[PDB]
Design a protein around this ligand. Structure first.
Ligand SMILES: [Ca+2]
Ligand SMILES: [Ca+2]
Ligand SMILES: [Ca+2]
Length: 187
C-alpha cells in the first residue's frame, strides 16, 4: 500500500487542489469551479478562447479520472475511491508504467496556468500567484520555489515541472525536490 508519507501527499492534493467546493468529494462541479477561479485569477473572459480550451481539457481529465476511480458509477469520486486508484497508479509507475493520461493532461494544464508569461518557465511570482489562490502561504510558496529551482540554478520548464510532478505523487523519499511542488512541506 501507500506509506503514510505517500497517502498524506495524495490526500492534500485531493482536499486542497481537486475539491474546489470543499464538500469532501470530487465531481464535475469541482472542475466548473476550478475554471471560474482561474478565470478570476488571470482575468480570462467567459466563453473566450482560454476559457473554452480549459473547459474542453478539464472534461477530458474528469472523464479519465471518473473511468479510473469511480467504482460505483455515481459520478462522484470519494477519498476512498481516490486512494484505491492511487495505490494502483503508484505500483503501476513502480513497474515501469506511465501515470494515467488524465493526470498528465492535468499536469500540463497546471503548468500552463502557472506560466502566464508563456516563456516556458515558471518564475517565483507566477508560482506564488497560482499556489496562493489555493491557500498556500507566500513563505511556503517561496521556500518550495527555492527548492524546485535549486535557488535559481534550474529553470522550471514544462519538462522540469513534469518530472517534479511525478515525484510528488509517487516518491517515498522525504528528500525528493518534487515533494514541494504544491507548497513547502515541513519534513
Ligand atoms: Ca467537491
Ligand atoms: Ca463514486
Ligand atoms: Ca513564465
Amino acid at each position: 500500500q501507500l506509506s503514510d508519507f505517500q497517502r498524506n501527499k495524495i490526500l492534500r492534493v485531493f482536499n486542497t487542489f481537486y475539491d474546489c467546493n470543499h464538500d469532501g468529494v470530487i465531481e464535475w462541479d469541482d472542475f466548473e469551479l476550478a475554471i471560474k477561479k482561474i478565470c478570476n485569477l488571470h482575468s480570462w473572459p467567459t466563453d473566450g478562447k482560454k476559457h473554452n480550451e480549459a473547459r474542453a481539457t478539464l472534461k477530458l481529465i474528469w472523464d479519465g479520472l471518473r473511468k479510473y476511480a469511480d467504482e460505483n458509477e455515481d459520478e462522484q469520486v470519494t477519498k476512498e475511491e481516490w486512494l484505491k486508484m492511487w495505490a494502483e497508479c503508484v505500483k503501476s509507475v513502480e513497474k515501469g508504467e506511465s501515470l494515467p493520461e488524465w493526470l498528465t493532461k492535468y499536469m500540463n494544464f497546471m503548468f500552463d496556468v502557472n506560466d502566464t508569461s508563456g516563456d516556458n518557465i515558471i518564475d517565483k511570482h507566477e508560482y506564488s500567484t497560482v499556489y496562493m489562490s489555493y491557500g498556500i502561504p507566500k513563505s511556503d510558496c517561496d521556500a518550495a520555489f527555492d527548492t524546485l529551482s535549486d535557488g535559481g540554478k534550474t529553470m522550471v520548464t514544462r519538462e522540469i515541472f513534469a518530472r517534479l510532478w511525478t515525484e510528488y505523487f509517487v516518491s517515498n523519499d522525504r528528500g525528493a525536490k518534487g515533494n514541494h511542488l504544491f507548497g513547502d512541506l515541513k519534513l
